[PDB]
């Protein structure tokens, strides 16, 4: 209680001591990226209902897309050919992940179940490999580390590392107090950051099971979270219509990306291969490209007729896919 | 077509996938999705558990009762921003839980994601409410003082065998939920109050007619006739 608030103000004053300058002051001399005019190069039509999630495969050619009609469609972006179409038991799916190997694809939602689907079977049909069922809330995000390990965030305020083979939660993460909405695995796949509705973002250790650091600053639910390519910074997106880049080592927010005109929350956030650009999808039926270092809106990807639910940048950084409640997905480039 | 033999076969696979998707699209359009909100003891399950399907006049309706998630509900209500209606069941008998239900209705009615979605309120257990009024027990004025000042409206349609006391009680609850719905929203969405009971099995027909009116009103703006 008293010790608790003492420790709290202690942490606060430490961060302040480390706040010698600002990212803005530092990059004041860095030349702006300039206007980033990106045009829709492909439009993947075929989903019947609102697209709620998407994930690029490591090959940067295939991507899975979830919809409220209960269908996960794998698309060959290069040729706009639907590779596979998986019917899902629960129509209400809020998340979809693509395995780094490409052998599996997992989805989850208000079913409170994370179903892993083996894409490459001898029978030639996509079949549900395992149905993880421990979580007690809607699963909001699921990201694969192995073809045998997957971290899933849930509205039960808890995240969990699972062993696909056994079907048991190897590790649970119960630090958050509000519905965890997003999770982002570090490039090194040793740490994962999760943003929740408690306006808090906690960095976790996947093998120790403990919350290493806790970052605050958003005034509302952190709807989206993403990791900077170096694995030393993470950017967040909240209903506060603000995006904030927190540095892991400094333990302190570096820059905030807000514009007076923007009054709609961020649904999805993502960085470029270099991390210079922070592409975030707002509820204004469009996505804004923000120069991360200079905190200036470089460009706008406006081609959607509904809330841009998901945004993903290819691993090769060649293209940016954007899924919307308009049942369409556009590969901007 | 500058496509290899394997490319052509992949395009063919995509076309067959597209065909099954089209048949699926037809079923999706025909099915009208409904969201069964409501608290416990409301008997939400017995009006007609995560999902329930029923068909009236060759029109199939899918009713989704999401009771697995509690506490903050706005986060998962974003998913049901396309349902044709939100069946909301209220236990008229319990007045202690009534104020909570009013708060829930207010939240649902004002939810930014449900600002164009209509609500078919089904005051349930109207029988139990009557028994409480007949026996007196807890006065409704105790829970809501306005009940004394309240009088049965002229527009009210008294059912046969309804003591004016029982009648005033029923329309008092309806008045509260109407008051809640009239304050917010601007003709974008409407509330359809239907006094219902446990034995009452005509509930499915009420849903049907109310759904017709809602879709008619939307088609009247979609075809630009308004």
């Amino acid at each position, epitope marked *: 209680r008293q010790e608790a608030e003492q420790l709290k103000n202690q942490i606060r004053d430490a961060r302040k001591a480390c706040a010698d300058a600002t990212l803005s002051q530092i990059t004041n001399n860095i030349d702006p990226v300039g206007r980033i005019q990106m045009r829709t190069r492909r439009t993947l039509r075929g989903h019947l209902a609102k697209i709620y999630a998407m994930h690029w495969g490591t090959d940067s050619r295939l991507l899975v897309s979830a919809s409220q009609d209960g269908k996960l469609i794998i698309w060959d972006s290069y040729t706009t050919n639907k590779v596979h179409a998986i019917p899902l038991r629960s129509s209400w799916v809020m998340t979809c992940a693509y395995a780094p190997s490409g052998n599996y694809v997992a989805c989850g939602g208000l079913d409170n179940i994370c179903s892993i689907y083996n894409l490459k079977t001898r029978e030639g049909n996509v079949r549900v490999s395992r149905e993880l069922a421990g979580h007690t809330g809607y699963l909001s995000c699921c990201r694969f580390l192995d073809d045998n390990q997957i971290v899933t965030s849930s509205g039960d305020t808890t995240c969990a590392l699972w062993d696909i083979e056994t079907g048991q939660q190897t590790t649970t993460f119960t630090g958050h107090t509000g519905d965890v909405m997003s999770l982002s695995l570090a490039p090194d796949t040793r740490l994962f950051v999760s943003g929740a509705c408690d306006a808090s973002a906690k960095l976790w250790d996947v093998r120790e099971g403990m919350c290493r650091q806790t970052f605050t600053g958003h005034e509302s639910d952190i709807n989206a979270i993403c990791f900077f390519p170096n694995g030393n910074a993470f950017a967040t997106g909240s209903d506060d219509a603000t995006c904030r880049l927190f540095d892991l080592r400094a333990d302190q927010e570096l820059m905030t990306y807000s514009h007076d005109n923007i009054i709609c929350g961020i649904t999805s956030v993502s960085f470029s291969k270099s991390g210079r650009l922070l592409l975030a999808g707002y509820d204004d039926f469009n996505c804004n490209v923000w120069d991360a270092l200079k905190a200036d809106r470089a460009g706008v990807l406006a081609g959607h007729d509904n809330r841009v639910s998901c945004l993903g940048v290819t691993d090769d950084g060649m293209a940016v896919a954007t899924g919307s409640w308009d049942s369409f997905l556009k590969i901007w480039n | 077509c500058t496509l*290899s033999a394997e490319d052509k076969a992949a395009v063919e696979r995509s076309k067959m996938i597209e065909k099954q998707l089209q048949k699926d699209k037809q079923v999706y359009r025909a099915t009208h999705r409904l969201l069964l909100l409501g608290a416990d003891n409301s008997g939400k399950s017995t009006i007609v558990i995560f999902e329930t399907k029923f068909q009236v006049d060759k029109v199939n309706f899918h009713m989704f009762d999401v009771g697995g998630q509690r506490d903050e509900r706005r986060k998962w209500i974003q998913c049901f921003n396309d349902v044709t209606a939100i069946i909301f069941v209220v236990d008229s008998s319990d007045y202690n839980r009534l104020q909570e239900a009013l708060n829930l209705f207010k939240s649902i009615w004002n939810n930014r994601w449900l600002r164009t979605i209509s609500v078919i309120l089904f005051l349930n257990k109207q029988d139990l409410l009557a028994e409480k009024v007949l026996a007196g027990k807890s006065k409704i004025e105790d829970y809501f003082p306005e009940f004394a000042r309240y009088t049965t409206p002229e527009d009210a349609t008294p059912e046969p065998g309804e003591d004016p006391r029982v009648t005033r009680a029923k329309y008092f609850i309806r008045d509260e939920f109407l008051r809640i719905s009239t304050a917010s929203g601007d003709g974008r969405h409407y509330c359809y109050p239907h006094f219902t009971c446990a034995v009452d099995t005509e509930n499915a027909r009420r849903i049907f007619n109310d759904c017709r009116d809602i879709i008619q009103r939307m088609h009247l703006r979609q075809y630009e006739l308004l």
Partner: single-chain antibody
Amino acid sequence: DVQLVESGGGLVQPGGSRKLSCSASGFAFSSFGMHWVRQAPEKGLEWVAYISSGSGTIYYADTVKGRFTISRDDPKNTLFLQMTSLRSEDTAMYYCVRSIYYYGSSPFDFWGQGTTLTVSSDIVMTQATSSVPVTPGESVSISCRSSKSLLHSNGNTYLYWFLQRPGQSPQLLIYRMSNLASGVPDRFSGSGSGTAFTLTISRLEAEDVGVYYCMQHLEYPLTFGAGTKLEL
């Protein structure tokens, strides 16, 4: 388990007609486009017919064009080949092959056992060495040349390698020039230049004895190579 048992073969007087039937079990027959490939008693493989998923695109070979017809009964999981005007040149064992086509697929993966029928412009695949003697533990390099570069603009070289172990149906070893097939030891490696290709089998074992065929999938008719035998 995936099985493709075909039946309906036997002695037929010239000019007769017979229907070959391949019963499928253990896979989604509907999703897999099927092919019929025959092997003359002493010669190599020759693509006969191909029916796509959903009985859409049905290509045939010039030799059997018109005389033969391939049909698929998706509900009954069966592939049929009604052959008419059976000439003495149609005496061969017919194999039903499954082939699914999607980005990253392994076409021609499973071959059926085979049924024997005894009758009383296209790219040329040239396997120069008919035979190559080799002892176990050594490394071989079966070569196959092509009339046209099999490298399509899509960047995929469509050259497939198959192994027919004595008394056994062919088995896909390398698909699309380099991609190794599932269940195949890593000792097999595929190299290609667009026109000339080479299958390197390192640390040869006893299992690797058999004939090796190079098939092109750039365009139909699909053309198999004469075959290079590896004798112990």
